Write a protein that binds this ligand. Structure first.
Ligand SMILES: [Ca+2]
Ligand SMILES: [Ca+2]
Ligand SMILES: [Mg+2]
Ligand SMILES: [Mg+2]
Length: 352
């Protein structure tokens, strides 16, 4: 039915007689689970010749899908991607159509143009080696890193972000914090409580980053990590995955990108692989960001703890989905799924 629906929308935009045909090129990830986005191929006729275009749909998930997040606003995702395209030179897919109602497919979705490129893999994590990024020269890896930090710096430099992105909304960090707490509560419902995360929320509250939270917020990409960027020749050609897009302190995106790589380094170490220890180091990332923006980042410590909580919410949702699909048993202790738990306990033992 998604291909049927896109074919119909194509019939309403292309010349009469184009007779578009739409098929699914890719609707699952490499483990056979439904993917975040679906790649479709559209074929039609124009002046006696075949035209073929790839399109990408993002569809909101239904309850029986075990969604990661408690609510979805695909309309906010679509508008940020559009505005980023308009206001900056950060490469993003061209948006084409949003169906906000859910009356057509069952749930809201939007369509974008396909961008060709490669992503540093999540499956297996790129720190496991045997992939284009891990196997590239150090120089090439650092070019990609620096270009990706540069894209982030550009996003964070959009003027008057609270006005321009007002649909996204005490401080912005306060409101984001309450949303993470709601995400945890949502996840608890599917898999059980984590005493660790509950003590961490208390820690986060009692060591609030007052200065960072008081400064002017910026547009936050959210899941700001190399796995969510398409590259060609080690340069970004599309920044993807705006699900966690927000307004907030710039430290949150920068801490997220650095910590995301540390979670994958930790998984690689558990696999007794050495990983990519020279990639996404805090010192290098802070130097690049600060040289590009002229803005001093607050200490990232709180934001790393905070990122750890959010990764744990993801793992709690992945865990629930895997039991729902019979793939695992509901774990004796949910914290077993948090392989960054030790990373987090060491951070919580520091004094900043
Ligand atoms: Ca542009
Ligand atoms: Ca200590
Ligand atoms: Mg992603
Ligand atoms: Mg996502």
């Amino acid at each position: 039915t998604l291909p049927a629906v896109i074919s119909r929308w194509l019939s309403s935009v292309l010349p009469g007689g184009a007779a578009p045909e739409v098929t699914v090129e890719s609707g699952v990830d490499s483990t056979g689970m439904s993917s975040e986005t679906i790649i479709l191929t559209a074929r039609w006729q124009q002046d006696g010749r075949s035209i073929q275009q790839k399109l990408v749909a993002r569809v909101a998930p239904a309850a029986e899908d075990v969604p990661v997040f408690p609510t979805y606003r695909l309309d906010h995702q679509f508008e940020v991607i559009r505005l980023v395209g308009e206001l900056t030179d950060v490469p993003v897919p061209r948006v084409r159509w949003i169906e906000t109602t859910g009356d057509v497919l069952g749930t809201p979705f939007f369509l974008m143009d396909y961008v060709e490129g490669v992503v540093p893999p999540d499956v297996m994590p790129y720190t496991f080696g045997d992939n284009w990024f891990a196997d590239a020269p150090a120089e090439r890896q650092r070019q990609l890193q620096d270009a990706t930090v540069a894209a982030l710096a550009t996003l964070h430099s959009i003027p008057n972000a609270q006005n321009t992105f007002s649909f996204l909304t005490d401080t912005t960090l306060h409101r984001h914090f309450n949303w993470v707490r709601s995400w945890y509560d949502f996840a608890v419902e599917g898999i059980g409580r984590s005493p660790l995360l509950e003590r961490t929320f208390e820690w986060l509250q009692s060591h609030w980053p007052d200065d960072a939270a008081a400064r002017e917020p910026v547009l936050l990409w959210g899941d700001a990590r190399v796995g969510n960027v398409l590259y060609r020749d080690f340069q970004p050609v599309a920044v993807l995955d705006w699900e966690m897009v927000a307004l907030g302190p710039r430290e949150l995106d920068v801490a997220w990108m650095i910590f995301a790589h540390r979670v994958f380094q930790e998984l690689a170490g558990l696999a007794t692989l050495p990983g990519l220890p020279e990639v996404m180091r805090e010192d290098d990332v802070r130097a690049t960001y600060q040289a590009l923006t002229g803005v001093e980042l607050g200490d990232l410590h709180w934001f790393y703890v905070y990122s750890g909580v959010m990764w744990a919410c993801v793992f709690m949702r992945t865990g629930a989905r895997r039991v729902h699909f019979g793939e695992i048993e509901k774990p004796d202790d949910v914290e077993s799924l948090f392989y960054h738990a030790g990373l987090m306990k060491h951070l919580l033992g520091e004094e900043h």
